[PDB]
């Protein structure tokens, strides 16, 4: 078997030009309902696993160009619950660019306070890809429909985070429809679900775009605005209200908690409400207000359930052709600080899953690296002469791209870019 190769100098330049990064991705609700006995309360919304990136295709072509069927180059993958002794349900990624596990569930046997979705992955010809995980997920025995104190967060949605809202008709898992967007409007496809920003707007808010949001958690009554975390299109000013027994209340200052059925009040008009007509999202009114001037009974299909979704992400590249070892784990870089400067210019990185078999690349230049720990690394900023055969001191600001490169070739595109600034 061809021994691993050090990503050659020329190899980098090639990537920097193309940059067809193969990137996995995952989306899931930060919380999950634990099923007791032999029950089975699936994960809603269903954990999706997109496979964005142009490199994904370039891999298909490269694989077949060496003898691979439409089946031997088709990326396969399973999904499971951390270190649980259950079976990793498979995924059907044929033709599709994603895939949701509409049947993932956790039993009460797993006495874990937390856990995280495990996604085994490999190509058609058993070519190992790696194991991609998702952020942690808290286990709840039941959504505290009772009051919520702003002391125990994590269960309280905050202005800015992402969330998901679905609908359950007549108590049937086959009906469940999630709030989605496509074509330019807000659907309700029970096949797809999307994360929607939930900014908090002060009662004295204007019309729409170019507005201002303010930090803080969200309690029923506040004028919140839901923006599509992808397309961008959002629904006009809305006011969330705590609901129960098909009745949308107007007097509820309680803080919105995870898994809490609630109705959304449109703009400052008379009544109306956001409801799902078993097809798409259309306007309504919910005029019945006989009970109390503060208890406006609302027609079903408008009592969406709240949930805060997260998002895991991993991007890499086969900078030096296939590799005997998996591209997992994936080194992520969150912080990049400069230590000192000049003759001793050094860089300290901090992220996750860092490995001792890594090296940082300043553009097309490989700089010495020191492995601190799983989330810290020290490299040496190469002299500017390594980018300007003519100078010995920064004559002009030169911005080179940063990137992590393993020893077998696999390169992990960061996003950060170190820039050489003239020493004052």
């Amino acid at each position: 078997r061809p021994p691993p190769k050090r990503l050659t100098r020329e190899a980098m330049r090639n990537y920097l030009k193309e940059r067809g990064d193969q990137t996995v991705l995952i989306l899931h609700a930060k919380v999950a309902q634990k099923s007791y006995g032999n029950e089975k309360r699936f994960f809603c919304p269903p954990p999706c696993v997109y496979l964005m990136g142009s490199g994904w295709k370039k891999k298909k072509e490269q694989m077949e160009r060496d003898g691979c069927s439409e089946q031997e180059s088709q990326p396969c993958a399973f999904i499971g619950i951390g270190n649980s002794d259950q079976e990793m349900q498979q995924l059907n990624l044929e033709g599709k660019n994603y895939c949701t596990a509409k049947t993932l569930y956790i039993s009460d046997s797993d006495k874990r306070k937390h856990f995280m979705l495990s996604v085994k992955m490999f190509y058609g010809n058993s070519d190992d890809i790696g194991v991609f995980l998702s952020k942690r997920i808290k286990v709840i025995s039941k959504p505290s429909k009772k009051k919520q104190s702003l002391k125990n967060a994590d269960l309280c949605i905050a202005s800015g985070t992402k969330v998901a809202l679905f609908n359950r008709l007549r108590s049937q898992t086959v009906s469940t429809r999630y709030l989605h967007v496509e074509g330019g409007n807000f659907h309700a496809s029970s096949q797809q679900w999307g994360a929607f920003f939930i900014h908090l707007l002060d009662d004295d808010e204007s019309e729409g775009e170019e507005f201002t949001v303010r930090d803080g958690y969200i309690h029923y009554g506040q004028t919140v605005k839901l923006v599509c975390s992808v397309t961008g299109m959002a629904l006009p000013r809305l006011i969330i209200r705590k609901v129960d027994k098909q009745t949308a209340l107007l007097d509820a200052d309680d803080p919105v908690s995870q898994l809490h059925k609630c109705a959304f009040y449109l703009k400052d008009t008379e009544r109306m409400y956001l409801c799902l007509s078993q097809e798409r999202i259309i306007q309504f009114q919910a005029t019945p207000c006989p009970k109390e001037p503060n208890k406006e009974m609302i027609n079903d299909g408008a009592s969406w359930t709240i949930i805060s979704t997260d998002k895991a992400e991993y991007t890499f590249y086969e900078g030096m052709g296939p590799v005997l070892a998996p591209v997992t784990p994936v080194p992520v870089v969150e912080s990049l600080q400069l230590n000192g400067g000049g003759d001793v210019a050094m860089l300290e990185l901090t992220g996750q899953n860092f490995t001792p078999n890594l090296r940082v690349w300043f553009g097309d230049v490989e700089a010495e690296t020191m492995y601190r720990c799983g989330e810290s690394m020290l490299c040496v900023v190469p002299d500017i002469s390594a980018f300007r055969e003519g100078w010995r001191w920064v004559r002009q600001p030169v911005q080179v791209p940063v990137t992590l490169v393993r020893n077998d070739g696999i390169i992990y595109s960061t996003s950060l870019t170190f820039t050489y600034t003239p020493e004052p």
């Binding site: 807000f186 775009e209 006009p236 449109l266 703009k267 109306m272």
Partner: peptide, 19 residues
């Protein structure tokens, strides 16, 4: 309160209602 998130509005049915 110092930040600012832009977007793209979209109204289903009965938009003039808000007046």
């Amino acid at each position: 309160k110092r930040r600012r998130q832009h977007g793209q509005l979209w109204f289903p049915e009965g938009f003039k209602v808000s007046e």
